[PDB]
Curated annotation (Swiss-Prot), chain A:
Domain notes: The JAMM motif is required for the deubiquitination and degradation of ubiquitinated substrates.
Additional comment: Present with 16400 molecules/cell in log phase SD medium.
Protein name: Ubiquitin carboxyl-terminal hydrolase RPN11
Organism: Saccharomyces cerevisiae (strain ATCC 204508 / S288c)
Taxonomic lineage from the root: Eukaryota, Fungi, Dikarya, Ascomycota, Saccharomycotina
Gene Ontology BP terms: mitochondrial fission; peroxisome fission; proteasome assembly; proteasome storage granule assembly; proteasome-mediated ubiquitin-dependent protein catabolic process; protein deubiquitination
Domain MPN residue range list: 6-132
Cysteine pairings via disulfide bonds: none
Role, per record: Component of the lid subcomplex of the 26S proteasome, a multiprotein complex involved in the ATP-dependent degradation of ubiquitinated proteins. RPN11 is the only catalytically active member of the lid and serves as the essential deubiquitinase of the proteasome.
Subunit: Component of the lid subcomplex of the 19S proteasome regulatory particle complex (also named PA700 complex). The 26S proteasome consists of a 20S proteasome core and two 19S regulatory subunits. Interacts directly with RPN8 and STS1.
Record family assignment: Belongs to the peptidase M67A family.
Curated annotation (Swiss-Prot), chain B:
Interval of the full protein contained in this chain: 37 to 73 of 434
Disulfide bond positions: none
Compartments, as annotated in UniProt: Cytoplasm; Nucleus
Taxonomic superkingdom: Eukaryota
Protein species of origin: Saccharomyces cerevisiae (strain ATCC 204508 / S288c) (Baker's yeast)
Descriptive protein name: 26S proteasome regulatory subunit 6A
Gene: RPT5
Role description: The 26S proteasome is involved in the ATP-dependent degradation of ubiquitinated proteins. The regulatory (or ATPase) complex confers ATP dependency and substrate specificity to the 26S complex.
Lineage, broadest ranks: Eukaryota, Fungi, Dikarya, Ascomycota, Saccharomycotina
Modifications made to the protein after synthesis: N-acetylated by NAT1.
UniProt family annotation: Belongs to the AAA ATPase family.
From Swiss-Prot, chain C:
Function description: Exists either covalently attached to another protein, or free (unanchored). When covalently bound, it is conjugated to target proteins via an isopeptide bond either as a monomer (monoubiquitin), a polymer linked via different Lys residues of the ubiquitin (polyubiquitin chains) or a linear polymer linked via the initiator Met of the ubiquitin (linear polyubiquitin chains).
Every Ubiquitin-like domain range: 1-75
Subcellular location: Cytoplasm; Nucleus
Effect of residue 28 to R: Deficiency in ubiquitin-protein conjugate formation
Phylogenetic lineage: Eukaryota, Fungi, Dikarya, Ascomycota, Saccharomycotina
Boundaries of the shown chain within the full protein: 2 to 76 of 128
Cross-link Glycyl lysine isopeptide (Gly-Lys) (interchain with K-? in acceptor proteins), where in sequence: 75
Impact reported for residue 62 to R: Deficiency in ubiquitin-protein conjugate formation. Loss of DNA repair function
Name under which the protein is recorded: Ubiquitin
Amino acid sequence: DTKETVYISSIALLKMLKHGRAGVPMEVMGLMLGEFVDDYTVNVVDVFAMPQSGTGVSVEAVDDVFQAKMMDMLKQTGRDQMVVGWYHSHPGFGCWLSSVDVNTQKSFEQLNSRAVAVVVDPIQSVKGKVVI
Amino acid sequence: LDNEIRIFRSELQRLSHENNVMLEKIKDNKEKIKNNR
Amino acid sequence: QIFVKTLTGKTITLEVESSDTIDNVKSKIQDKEGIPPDQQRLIFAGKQLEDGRTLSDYNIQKESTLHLVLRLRGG
C-alpha cells in the first residue's frame, strides 16, 4: 500500500481551480470522476460541482440529485466514466482535513475502499508553487 | 357551438402545462435563497 | 427483492417487499454498507424518498431500480 501515483488530466485540474476560486472567500465543493486500477494509478478524468451553501469555513451539498441527474445525462455522450472521489477547498488556510471531512470520507471508503479526498488552497496557490 | 369545447378545452389543457412549469422554476429559486439565507 | 445502485456505479440488491418502513429500510444499508441514514439520500426517478410516504405509495415493484447518495459536508 504505497507508491500510488495519482495521475490527473489537465482538463480536470483547471476546472478544479476555476470553480475552486470563483467562490472565494467562501469555500466550495465538487466531485471527481475516474477509475480505480489494481493498486497504483488511481487516475482522474473529469470533475463537476454539486450545488451548495458556501461559507468561509463550511459548506454542504444542498441538492442530492444534480450529481445523479447529470451522470445519467452524461452517458448519452459517455464522455467520462463513473465516480471515484470528491474534493473541497480551504481558501487561505492550509491543505488538510477536519473532523467533518472524515465523517463524510469515512462513508466513501466503507462504500468503496480506495476513494479519495482532494484539498486545494487557491489563495496562496501562485503561478509557481501549487499546494494541492 | 359543439366545436367550441372540442377546441377551447385544448387551450385549457395547454395553460395548465404552462402554469405548472412556471410554478416550479420559481420554487427552484425559492429554495436557493433559503440555502444562501 | 430490489436493486440499489450508487454514485460509484456499484450495485447492491436487497430482499424486501411492499411492506417496508423507511426507518427500517435505512437500517438495511447500515446492515451491509455501514452507513448511518443521516448520511443517506435515496432517489426514485427524481423523487427523493421522503421517509413519511412509505413505499406503498411509490410503486416499488419487484426488481425496481434505486439510487443511493451520500451527504457531503466540509469545513
